[PDB]
Design a protein around this ligand. Structure first.
Ligand SMILES: *[C@@H]1O[C@H](CO)[C@@H](O[C@@H]2O[C@H](CO)[C@@H](O[C@@H]3O[C@H](CO[C@H]4O[C@H](CO)[C@@H](O[C@@H]5O[C@H](CO)[C@@H](O)[C@H](O)[C@H]5NC(C)=O)[C@H](O)[C@@H]4O[C@@H]4O[C@H](CO)[C@@H](O[C@@H]5O[C@H](CO)[C@H](O)[C@H](O)[C@H]5O)[C@H](O)[C@H]4NC(C)=O)[C@@H](O)[C@H](O[C@H]4O[C@H](CO)[C@@H](O[C@@H]5O[C@H](CO)[C@@H](O)[C@H](O)[C@H]5NC(C)=O)[C@H](O)[C@@H]4O[C@@H]4O[C@H](CO)[C@@H](O)[C@H](O)[C@H]4NC(C)=O)[C@@H]3O)[C@H](O)[C@H]2NC(C)=O)[C@H](O)[C@H]1NC(C)=O
Ligand SMILES: *[C@@H]1O[C@H](CO)[C@@H](O[C@@H]2O[C@H](CO)[C@@H](O[C@@H]3O[C@H](CO[C@H]4O[C@H](CO)[C@@H](O[C@@H]5O[C@H](CO)[C@@H](O)[C@H](O)[C@H]5NC(C)=O)[C@H](O)[C@@H]4O)[C@@H](O)[C@H](O[C@H]4O[C@H](CO)[C@@H](O[C@@H]5O[C@H](CO)[C@@H](O)[C@H](O)[C@H]5NC(C)=O)[C@H](O)[C@@H]4O[C@@H]4O[C@H](CO)[C@@H](O)[C@H](O)[C@H]4NC(C)=O)[C@@H]3O)[C@H](O)[C@H]2NC(C)=O)[C@H](O)[C@H]1NC(C)=O
Ligand SMILES: *[C@@H]1O[C@H](CO)[C@@H](O[C@@H]2O[C@H](CO)[C@@H](O)[C@H](O)[C@H]2NC(C)=O)[C@H](O)[C@H]1NC(C)=O
Ligand SMILES: *[C@@H]1O[C@H](CO)[C@@H](O[C@@H]2O[C@H](CO)[C@@H](O)[C@H](O)[C@H]2NC(C)=O)[C@H](O)[C@H]1NC(C)=O
Ligand SMILES: *[C@@H]1O[C@H](CO)[C@@H](O)[C@H](O)[C@H]1NC(C)=O
Ligand SMILES: *[C@@H]1O[C@H](CO)[C@@H](O)[C@H](O)[C@H]1NC(C)=O
Lengths: 293, 141, 153
């Protein structure tokens, strides 16, 4: 048009501009013949089927006027009216109108129809008819979007059970803590080094650490005895004794303390070992006590 | 002389289902979620928003509920098993299925056993051609 | 079973015997509903927690098939396999598996989990969920059994 600017013509096709001579054409993108003959696009809709070809392709192929017809002449092509580059026709997805037929097999149905293309009403050299069909699945997945939150009169009852963990300690001979003892009693000398370690036979949670809050020896099996020799006092070993060394405590489930043998002063011949232990959570507590060792 | 070139296009039909309140199937819901009680009766129907061909009938091959939106879940409660409703539950009644495009099944609300609070509904459907298939399944209801 | 005698069925539940008609049921000991709803037993283990209810109670309450589930559906109930009267489920005493959580305070830690009971997958009238927890002391007394007899010059 001699009034509208580049917006007057389709954006896809270049808008040529010169003094006293304005027009719009296309580029190498849509310029060739053979691929244009092979060029097309199709759209299968829920209720309609659309087939379109580039109008610039038709113009370049010499088809200034385009006549699009189907098996039924009542169906006729027309401009896209949405994107001006294309020219398209519509066909209802049924059998009987617009010349469409229904091809059905067990898997899923299909609709087939033919499109006739020509430059004019009559055909002189080539009669190109496009055979096209849309396949619609006969089985499909459907999901309800809206979820549900049902209400029920529920009965909730608290149950509480006391539990106890399993804890044991062993007397090892070597500094490597290899062989536990099994006899009910043992004999040793003062110069002998008493290597002892503790273990949890169950509940070896990674975040639960073993911390010796305090340890002591007793002349008798009865823990409640006034004569106590604290080996670990308030999470740390007793000082003034170089022989007291602990390799690990609170690092993991394996808590080991090293000390040499001793004997209570008096008529007490037998010596027992007792300990108190606090399980430490690594999430919050550092579980690595530090003191004036 | 004529040139013929084959063209094919993958398409899909439009299918949707709605949750009605009344036994007459009048008002669909619109909210993303709803709350209900066990005694409440869950009336549901399915419709085709397009392609309402007279000879294509709607047949519920199987329906089931899922605790989550993901259909591929082992915990499935089949409400319709192989084109027929699950027995041992008098509350399961379907007014129409395969007669026309309007397939409706009636059941009362339920809740999955466990920690699952939300329940979803999924279905599979087979379109039936009235020309050849009777499309009126019969079974030991 | 039409082959095994009274030993075939659990001793706790009475074994009924008649010509052409044998079976086993229970007595007034396990027959009522309300106390059965209130009846249960729990066991807190060192590494596992067990909760069980009388199978005869479930049968008498109309729950011919029993579905026991927890906060995590991977955990499922099963027969006791030690005393056939009970039916029980197991849960490791940790946080994360089987839906269990860890409730901790300064005195001592505690593990809590919920048990879901139903006759079938779906629930129609009542949704009874049993909230249970085991308390494990965080401080405990340990004594070495083996005494010592040191030698001195
Ligand atoms: C019912 O009915 C219905 C109807 O509808 C059905 O269904 C259907 O079916 C049909 C048939 O099968 C189909 O079609 C097919 O397809 C396939 C696949 O495809 C592929 O590819 C593509 C591309 O191309 C892709 O993508 C696509 O695309 C499209 C476009 O194109 C679109 O549309 C869509 O969308 C897409 N897809 C989707 C899914 O979406 C796909 O994916 C696929 O992929 C891949 O690819 C590859 C490559 O290509 C492949 O491989 C290759 O292939 C070739 C062909 O292509 C060959 O085969 C070779 O060998 C191979 O290696 C693979 O495989 C795939 N994957 C899978 C499968 O997975 C296809 O494959 C086919 O093809 C065939 O066929 C055709 C026809 O039809 C033919 O063509 C022919 O050719 C010749 C030469 O060769 C000439 O001459 C002529 O002319 C032509 N035409 C006619 C014949 O017509 C071809 O070739 C082939 O054939 C054969 O093959 C063999 C092997 O096996 C050989 O050996 C032989 O040789 C041949 N033949 C001859 C003759 O030669 C077709 O195309 C449809 O699809 C359906 N539908 C649906 C919806 O799907 C049903 O089934 C019924 N039922 C009852 C029961 O009946
Ligand atoms: C960190 O967290 C741990 C959590 O484990 C905590 O340690 C536990 O604390 C609880 C609370 O103290 C302990 O359980 C209390 O035991 C008290 C004394 O023992 C009772 O009860 C035993 C049965 O529970 C019984 O026999 C025991 O039976 C077990 C089998 O079931 C067996 O395994 C065990 O060996 C055996 N022996 C024991 C345990 O020694 C005992 O023989 C003895 O009779 C008991 O008095 C307590 O009852 C009070 O507390 C509970 C809540 O814990 C209340 O329950 C509430 O009741 C309401 C109705 O009244 C109801 O609506 C609520 O739903 C319900 N639940 C709540 C509130 O959570 C009780 O009613 C009662 O509460 C108050 O009592 C006062 C005075 O009597 C009364 O005036 C109030 O009215 C009443 N409250 C209310 C709301 O009415 C518990 O049963 C547990 O034993 C501890 N664990 C261990 C391993 O010992 C730590 O302390 C905690 N630490 C910190 C720092 O926070
Ligand atoms: C095809 O592409 C050509 C681009 O070469 C379009 O116009 C041509 O422009 C060049 C400018 O360098 C001229 O030398 C050519 O003479 C032009 N083509 C002709 C045929 O004169 C052309 O418009 C595009 N479309 C068609 C249908 O040829
Ligand atoms: C509950 O206890 C009764 C005992 O009275 C069990 O069976 C009953 O046996 C008496 C025999 O005097 C019959 O008169 C009753 O008819 C029996 N009960 C029924 C329901 O018929 C009974 O098996 C026990 N358990 C249950 C679940 O009822
Ligand atoms: C341990 O000793 C204390 C006090 O000496 C006493 O009260 C307690 O009964 C004793 N216990 C045993 C088991 O000997
Ligand atoms: C659904 O669950 C299956 C298996 O449980 C899984 O393979 C799939 O990825 C899941 N899909 C979605 C969307 O969650």
């Amino acid at each position: 048009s001699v009034e509208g600017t580049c917006e007057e013509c389709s954006i896809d096709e270049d808008c040529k501009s010169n003094n006293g001579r304005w027009h719009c054409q296309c580029k190498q993108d849509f310029n060739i013949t053979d691929i244009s003959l092979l060029e097309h696009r199709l759209e299968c809709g829920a209720n309609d089927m659309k087939v379109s070809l580039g109008k610039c392709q038709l113009k370049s192929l010499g088809f200034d006027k385009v006549f699009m017809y189907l098996s039924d002449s009542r169906c006729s092509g027309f401009n896209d009216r949405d994107n001006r580059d294309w020219v398209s026709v519509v066909t209802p997805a049924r059998d009987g109108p617009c010349g469409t037929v229904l091809t059905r097999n067990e898997t899923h149905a299909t609709y087939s129809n033919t499109l006739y293309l020509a430059d004019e009403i009559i055909i002189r050299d080539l009669n190109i008819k496009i055979n096209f069909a849309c396949s619609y699945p006969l089985d499909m997945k459907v999901s309800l979007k809206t979820a549900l939150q049902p209400m029920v009169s529920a009965l909730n009852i608290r149950v509480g059970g006391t539990g106890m963990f399993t804890v044991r300690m062993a007397l090892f001979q070597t500094p490597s803590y290899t062989q536990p003892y099994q006899g009910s009693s043992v004999t040793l000398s003062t110069e002998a080094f008493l290597y002892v370690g503790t273990m949890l036979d169950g509940g070896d949670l990674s975040r639960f650490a073993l911390l010796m809050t305090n340890c002591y020896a007793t002349p008798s099996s009865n823990a409640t005895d006034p004569l106590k020799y604290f080996i670990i006092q308030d999470r740390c070993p007793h000082t003034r004794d170089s022989t007291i060394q602990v390799v690990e405590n609170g690092e993991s489930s394996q808590g080991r303390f090293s000390v040499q043998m001793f004997r209570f002063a008096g008529n007490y011949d037998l010596v027992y070992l007792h300990c108190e232990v606090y399980l430490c959570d690594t999430m919050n507590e550092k579980c690595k006590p530090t003191c004036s060792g």
